[PDB]
Ligand binder design. Structure first.
Ligand code: CO8
Ligand code: CO8
Ligand code: CO8
Ligand code: CO8
Ligand code: NAP
Lengths: 678, 63, 63, 63
């Protein structure tokens, strides 16, 4: 049965030697995949000249709303996703983690792109870099998108999630994606891609799919293309030396396998709850997805005096794990996905047994069953600093080795000896042990969960890559970084330092900068609605002379009786030389000078972005304020009852009679819109 | 009166009922100033200046 | 601050020098209110109301 | 406090109940001053001086 690739808008299918998808829990072939004969150059052509300008013509707020719409469309029909994910041997909890983590990544990137991305095609990530003494030459860093495609080459473990946490930063960065899922599980990926395409939410050409091999895709990529890999370190190092990827110098974000430490600390004794949650965390992390996640614990580092206690606890807990069919009751661990994956796990176990030891039912795995069942395996290494095969071989299933340490200076070396890893974990309660652990073992791990009794109540777990934390470590883990919040959408963008005058950077960035030209238009910018506020709409307020009575009345009313304001003697011996006006009174007299009293579009105050005081304000010293509009960034009216509104940022430039800028800062302000979206 | 900020959500009884807050609310800068009324030592000490303010957000209105 | 009358001849040192007064002057309404502060008896008596004010002229600026 | 006008219909709670107003009322000159707080542009403009006040009648009491 054909599993149809989606290229150039048409659900095509290959013509050649076809690989086939075994069912995981039963063993039959109910799909077969092929991509031979599919024109990949025409696919990249259709993507670049169809879906790339359609994505790049949107603002970032529109792309975040599109991500939220696709997330709510994928949430409304998740039951067929569970039905397709049960074919991968996963349980209901494992498939829940996969599907709902993949959709929660979409909701998270929708929230981040709605809250912290501009109402613009472009995105200035800096504030401003003043490069001149007069101020007529400055620069700021723009993040324009890329006019090419993103090739995503995914592993078999998370067909929904591992595709859909790459698809969200790619779409939020305005590039079309060509997902190459792993052939061993691509039916759930085609279910996801079909649910996306048959909804009318995304533009045409904004997503492709090649069920099967790419073949002639990496030889066609231009320098505006990025490639994001997810697989083993034997494949991606051959894909890195691909001649077009190094010739056109395209970003190849490789991210590969890792031996993940789980260090028990010296302070933890078996009477504590810390020991019980250590054993629970290692067992749950080794039995989730039958140990087929990259962030699963595969090396357990324990203190030397606690090895027998940890081993007896793990044997007493892991024999309660029932391996079997996910649909029948009383089954905790599901299965693997292939007999080939089962043979690969067992031939890695025999490599670990060629120089290691044994604790439980390990390499005794039936290679003749009608199912990809592998028993939960705990190994042992009595000489951890002498066997390099433990620190170089990952058995990608329920297998996890154990090895002793010597008083928190061998445990750090055994944690760092993984050759560069992902998702480490220390389980302690002493905070200085965690400090010494991060000071040495954060060089090799891309994520480290310090698990104590306070953490374990609402902990996401060891093997839950959050969509707002950097997923990926150095060395053997690939060196790439994903999911870093808004760090991930910057792999799909070009960072450009745009030099020039501030009145030019204002027109480029669609904001106001510091020394740009202003639009003073005889009426108050607080009287304007959101749609008629332009970035640059300024206001030169009237003045106010700061006197000693102002200092006295503000120090009385606030209660801030600080000595530089209320003492004539101590202020003469301070850095100021005499008594100065409160900085909060400058901040309040500013808003006294620029706020419209009348009822208008301005709703609330919402916060204050970045205040700095520069020169002290004295008695006998006037104050004049320059309110000017800086950013607009409309909100999205989450209900039908809430008013259409947007959050305008105003740059405030107070100064004195010598025009030197005392207290320049930036207020946010929620401003009502005249027209909504509903 | 002292600051000069006569915004309608603070000085009008009618329009504050017609606003998002439901009634008159305390100024955000008066929360910011009465806070420094509450924690600042009056005496001469190691604290020299004020130097700025990092990141302010008003979460719920004060009545 | 109390009245809200932040007119430039009362609150600005620079603009009052460029005005007809030469320097900052007291509000005329504060002269009008401080007068009633100086003559109105606080105790309960025959005086009932305020009722108006016939013909006000300001002649020289109060500084 | 500021003006010094401590008339019994403003600062006493007992005698204002025994007066013609029924309770404490706002000063007439504070109505006259808060009005000028509401209609005056603070900035430098064509308006020079206050010059006086032609007529005034306090019609209904303000509470
Ligand atoms: C509520 C807190 C506790 C109670 C404390 C109460 C104390 C007070 O109220 S004092 C009254 C109000 N406070 C003040 O006026 C603060 C004093 N003013 C000052 O800026 C002081 O001159 C002082 C000593 C802090 C400056 O220090 P200085 O060594 O000269 O550094 P300097 O770089 O020139 O200025 C400081 C900051 O201004 C920033 N700045 C921003 N724009 C400019 C500009 N155009 N020019 C100069 N500096 C600027 C600088 O970047 C620097 O910030 P950062 O360190 O983050 O880069
Ligand atoms: C002087 C300037 C001119 C304006 C005239 C004067 C106007 C006023 O004085 S209004 C009176 C004072 N203002 C207030 O009290 C505003 C109260 N703040 C509010 O949140 C209001 O309910 C209102 C109307 C803005 C609604 O906010 P809402 O849309 O629900 O967003 P909300 O969920 O509350 O979060 C607001 C921000 O707080 C931040 N925040 C930080 N920590 C937290 C936390 N623990 N919980 C919630 N929010 C937090 C949020 O991140 C968010 O910021 P961001 O832009 O980064 O997303
Ligand atoms: C500081 C100097 C005084 C010292 C003591 C201080 C005492 C105080 O501060 S009291 C402060 C608060 N009091 C007030 O604001 C005044 C209260 N309001 C009043 O005047 C009451 O109407 C009251 C009962 C005392 C007197 O009213 P009363 O005379 O019975 O009838 P009323 O219809 O109101 O007419 C009164 C005057 O208002 C005028 N008026 C009334 N309605 C109108 C109108 N719609 N349009 C124009 N003018 C009007 C009338 O012309 C009349 O003036 P005139 O002497 O020229 O005929
Ligand atoms: C609040 C609403 C307004 C908003 C803006 C507020 C502006 C202000 O607050 S300014 C501060 C308040 N002003 C003051 O306290 C000082 C007022 N300024 C002045 O009096 C100025 O000297 C000025 C230029 C207006 C006087 O005008 P000037 O050209 O010198 O002529 P001058 O004859 O001296 O005065 C005019 C008035 O004084 C009157 N006057 C009465 N008695 C006398 C007297 N014994 N001697 C002199 N003049 C007198 C005259 O009747 C004349 O009024 P009218 O024209 O109706 O007959
Ligand atoms: N973020 C991470 O670090 C992360 C996340 C999840 C999984 N992993 C790692 O992934 C591994 C398991 O996944 P896997 O077995 O699927 O990895 P893999 O087989 O080595 O390769 C993964 C992907 O690369 C494709 N591929 C293989 N050989 C290729 C070649 N010569 N040219 C072009 N493409 C090729 C595969 O397609 P075919 O199906 O046709 O082979 C598949 O789509 C584990 O070791 C796990 O640690 C890492």
């Amino acid at each position: 049965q054909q599993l149809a690739s989606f290229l150039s808008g048409t659900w095509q299918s290959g013509r050649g030697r076809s690989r086939l998808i075994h069912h995981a829990i039963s063993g039959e072939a109910l799909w077969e995949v092929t991509s031979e004969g599919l024109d990949m150059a025409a696919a990249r052509q259709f993507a670049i000249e169809k879906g790339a300008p359609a994505l790049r013509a949107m603002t970032f707020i529109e792309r975040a709303a599109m991500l939220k719409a696709v997330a709510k469309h994928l949430l409304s029909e998740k039951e067929r996703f569970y039905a397709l994910s049960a074919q991968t041997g996963a349980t209901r909890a494992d498939s829940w983690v996969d599907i709902e983590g993949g959709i929660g990544t979409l909701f998270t990137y929708a929230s981040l792109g709605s809250r912290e991305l501009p109402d613009d095609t472009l995105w200035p990530e800096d504030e401003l870099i003043p490069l001149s003494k007069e101020g007529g030459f400055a620069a700021r860093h723009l993040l324009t998108s890329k006019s090419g495609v993103a090739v995503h080459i995914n592993a078999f473990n998370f067909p929904c999630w591992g595709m859909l946490e790459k698809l969200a930063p790619t779409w939020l960065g305005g590039m079309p994606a060509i997902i190459k899922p792993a052939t061993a599980t691509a039916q759930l990926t085609q279910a996801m891609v079909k649910s996306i395409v048959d909804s009318g939410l995304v533009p045409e050409g904004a997503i492709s799919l090649i069920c099967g091999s790419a073949g002639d895709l990496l030889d066609h990529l231009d320098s505006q293309d990025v490639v994001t890999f997810t697989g083993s370190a034997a494949t991606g190092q051959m894909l890195r030396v691909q001649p077009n990827i190094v010739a056109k110098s395209i970003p190849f974000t490789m991210e590969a396998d890792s031996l993940n430490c789980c260090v028990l600390g010296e302070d933890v004794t078996p009477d504590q709850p810390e020991f019980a949650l250590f054993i629970r965390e290692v067992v749950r992390e080794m039995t989730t997805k039958a140990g087929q996640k990259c962030t699963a614990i595969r090396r357990i580092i324990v203190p030397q005096a606690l090895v027998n206690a940890v081993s007896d606890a793990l044997v007493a807990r892991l024999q309660k794990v029932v391996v079997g069919d996910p649909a029948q009751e009383g089954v905790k661990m599901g299965a693997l996905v292939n007999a080939e994956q089962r043979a690969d796990v067992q031939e890695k176990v025999n490599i670990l047994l060629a120089a290691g030891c044994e604790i439980r039912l390990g390499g005794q795995a039936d290679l003749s069953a009608a199912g990809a069942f592998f028993p939960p395996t705990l190994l042992y290494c009595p000489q951890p600093d002498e066997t390099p095969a433990v620190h170089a071989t990952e058995a990608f299933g329920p297998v996890a080795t154990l090895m002793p340490a010597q008083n928190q200076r061998h445990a750090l070396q055994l944690a760092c000896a993984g050759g560069g890893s992902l998702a480490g974990t220390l389980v302690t309660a002493d905070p200085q042990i965690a400090r010494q652990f991060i000071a040495d073992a954060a060089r090799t791990h891309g994520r480290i969960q310090i698990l104590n009794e306070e953490s374990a109540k609402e902990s996401t777990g060891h093997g839950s890559p959050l969509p707002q934390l950097v997923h990926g470590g150095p060395g053997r883990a690939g060196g790439g970084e994903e999911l870093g919040g808004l760090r991930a959408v910057k792999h799909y963008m070009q960072r450009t330092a745009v030099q020039g005058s501030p009145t030019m950077l204002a027109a480029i960035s669609k904001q106001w900068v510091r020394g740009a030209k202003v639009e003073e238009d005889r009426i108050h910018p607080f009287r304007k609605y959101f749609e008629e506020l332009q970035p640059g709409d300024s206001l030169l307020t009237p003045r106010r002379t700061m006197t000693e009575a102002d200092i006295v009345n503000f120090a009385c009313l606030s209660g801030d009786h600080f000595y530089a304001h209320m003492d004539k003697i101590a202020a003469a011996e301070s850095i100021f030389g005499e008594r100065v006006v409160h900085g909060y009174f400058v901040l309040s007299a500013a808003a006294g000078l620029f706020v419209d009293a009348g009822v208008g579009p301005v709703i609330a105050n919402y916060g204050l972005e970045s205040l700095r005081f520069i020169e002290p304000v004295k008695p006998g010293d006037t104050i004049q304020v320059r309110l000017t509009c800086k950013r607009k960034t409309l909100k999205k009216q989450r209900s039908a009852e809430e008013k259409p509104t947007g959050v305008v940022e105003w740059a405030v430039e107070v100064f004195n009679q010598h025009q030197t800028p005392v207290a320049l800062y930036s207020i946010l302000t929620l401003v009502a819109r005249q027209h909504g979206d509903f």
